[PDB]
Design a protein around this ligand. Sequence first.
Ligand SMILES: Cc1cn([C@H]2C[C@H](O)[C@@H](CO)O2)c(=O)[nH]c1=O
Length: 207
Amino acid sequence: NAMTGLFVTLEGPEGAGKSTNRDYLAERLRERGIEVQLTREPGGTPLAERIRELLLAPSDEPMAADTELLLMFAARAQHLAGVIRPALARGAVVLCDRFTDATYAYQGGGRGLPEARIAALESFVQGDLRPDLTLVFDLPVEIGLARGRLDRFEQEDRRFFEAVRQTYLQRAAQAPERYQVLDAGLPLAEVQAGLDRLLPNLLERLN
Ligand SMILES: Cc1cn([C@H]2C[C@H](O)[C@@H](CO)O2)c(=O)[nH]c1=O
């Protein structure tokens, strides 16, 4: 039937080689003549980036959990219509830094919002669309490393970030067919060799 690309999301903390690994993946794909679209959430479009700004900017006014969740999904709705679905329809590979798993992990695990409510909004915004593959970069939580000023989420405590970590691992266990957990605590080349063994699988998913 209708045109098909490949929707890959990457999840995990910065400082875990997510970005260099995404670049690696992108170059390996592009050398094979495949169109690759790099993007990130929240953000990805002019309006979505403005929503991002509201989400990250520290304020003395506390942001309600529901506000934070609805803003995340608002940016996502804009980003899906403007960037992601159009790329997939061109048969491109989308490599998206963070997606709805981050919502489950941060807003669910970190903020304590019920999984059911996040799931309701996921279906509302996305219909049946989910990533084809989600790469989780897992390693023990590191706090305070390489830190203008801390944004809203950076200000959180170690407990918050441990809940985020564990939620990703839980999610990957609930639907193993959609995830691959990468040991981001392993040497740099050893992880990119994992990416090599992955490429053929990606290519198959794509064509
Ligand atoms: C995509 C996404 C990011 N975040 C956080 C993680 C980062 O701290 C920040 C920017 O990606 O926003 C969420 O809390 N929920 C989400 O759904």
